[PDB]
Design a protein around this ligand. Sequence first.
Ligand SMILES: N[C@@H](Cn1oc(=O)[nH]c1=O)C(=O)O
Ligand SMILES: N[C@@H](Cn1oc(=O)[nH]c1=O)C(=O)O
Ligand SMILES: [Zn+2]
Ligand SMILES: [Zn+2]
Lengths: 258, 258
Amino acid sequence: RTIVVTTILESPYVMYKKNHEQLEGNERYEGYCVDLAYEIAKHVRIKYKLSIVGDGKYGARDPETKIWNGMVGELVYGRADIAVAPLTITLVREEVIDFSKPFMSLGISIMIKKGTPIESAEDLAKQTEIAYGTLASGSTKEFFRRSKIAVYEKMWSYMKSAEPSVFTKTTADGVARVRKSKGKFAFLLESTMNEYIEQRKPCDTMKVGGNLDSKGYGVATPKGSALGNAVNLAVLKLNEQGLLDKLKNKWWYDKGEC
Amino acid sequence: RTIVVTTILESPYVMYKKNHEQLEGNERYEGYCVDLAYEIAKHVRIKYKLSIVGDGKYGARDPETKIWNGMVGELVYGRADIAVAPLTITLVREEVIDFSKPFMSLGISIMIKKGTPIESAEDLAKQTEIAYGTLASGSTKEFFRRSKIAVYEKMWSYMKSAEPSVFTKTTADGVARVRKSKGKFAFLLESTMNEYIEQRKPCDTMKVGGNLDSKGYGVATPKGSALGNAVNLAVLKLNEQGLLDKLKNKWWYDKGEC
Ligand SMILES: N[C@@H](Cn1oc(=O)[nH]c1=O)C(=O)O
Ligand SMILES: N[C@@H](Cn1oc(=O)[nH]c1=O)C(=O)O
Ligand SMILES: [Zn+2]
Ligand SMILES: [Zn+2]
């Protein structure tokens, strides 16, 4: 009766509340996806427990082992009933899980330390002074790996062979690396995360240039799950009511710091 | 064996080629959705015939008669197998037809004649000198009708009661009305159409302010159609390959005039 909602600690989607160590269950967490899960469960009429994905990954398939990890794996192997997270709708995932229509639109983007002389991916690719990387095990990395577009192929060739690694285990690690690198590291990550960090102290980063692609996050459910239809209608309803907009403003901009 | 693809004459999605009167079948037409249909049919492996929707409507349900019109109706009553058009994914449509993940992201937007002293929906709502309207029978009208947000309720109250009508039968009619009204008419329409017209002679219109919402166009198929899954994967593939981007540039910007 209580459905398991897998998610991921990623600001400002899911974050520990100030005094989380004193709290239990869903009360431990707050953020955009916490509010979204709440609103969805209200419309779908279900009780639910939030579960931070053990491996802290979004979801990729190991090419030799064929096993899916991350939140995707939790749905594929039946350990979670739904994923409410900034989980990018991609072809390879759509082949193994279902997704609602997007609750958020976004694109890959470039984060720089303010003052870094970079305005575009083309700028990054043609030089080697400033290092650059992506999150490991996610859709941004796969974008570069899979691209057949010259600029992105070049970037991927550089990143894949870079030493030390330019692939971070979390978004937060990549941001920290941008902040501490005195302008010699730039981070490729989704515009949503980039825009959020731009609004937080110490206000030393910025998104530059246009997004590299155009895509969406969806609420995910096991292939053929009978929760799928209701979750999809719920997302559409929440969008048309203006609630998704309200939540984005709430967690990104209303308390912006920059 | 030959599937019927319903669509709509809407620039630059589907347009008559220069010498269409001399041509037959699919060759009569060109545009973004013509190219998209082609690419999709290639991936799904089907032969197809484009069919301009007889009533020239997107799709709404008559509240008394309960009948769906437009492209939606063509799918609901089994007269078309697929819709490849700028057809907005909405809750009420999702209840009766299926949609692919979005092939284009967009939002409601304001078109003005250059120089019109309007920058936002708030600007429109608080005054009566400049008239404003939407397409009849589409998702933009429904947005206003359905909103519970003060500014939009006010706008809807004004539009619903305005005399003469501010509701146009086509996008093209609303644009023409903006162009001929010396700044005394503004048109509410999707950002995609607005951005296209901004790039066409006589370059006398512009999009102003932010979009009012955030949504998408999907390729549509009858509820439970066995074409649905392949069409959805096809759209995702075309997006991830950069083809959708390439087509948007092709039909909007590559030959921009302004
Ligand atoms: N939403 C992404 C995870 N990730 O977040 C970023 O900012 N880049 C990236 O790959 C996914 O679902 O894989
Ligand atoms: N895509 C819209 C049709 N329409 O185009 C606009 O620009 N506004 C509007 O309502 C629909 O599917 O109803
Ligand atoms: Zn803590
Ligand atoms: Zn003609």
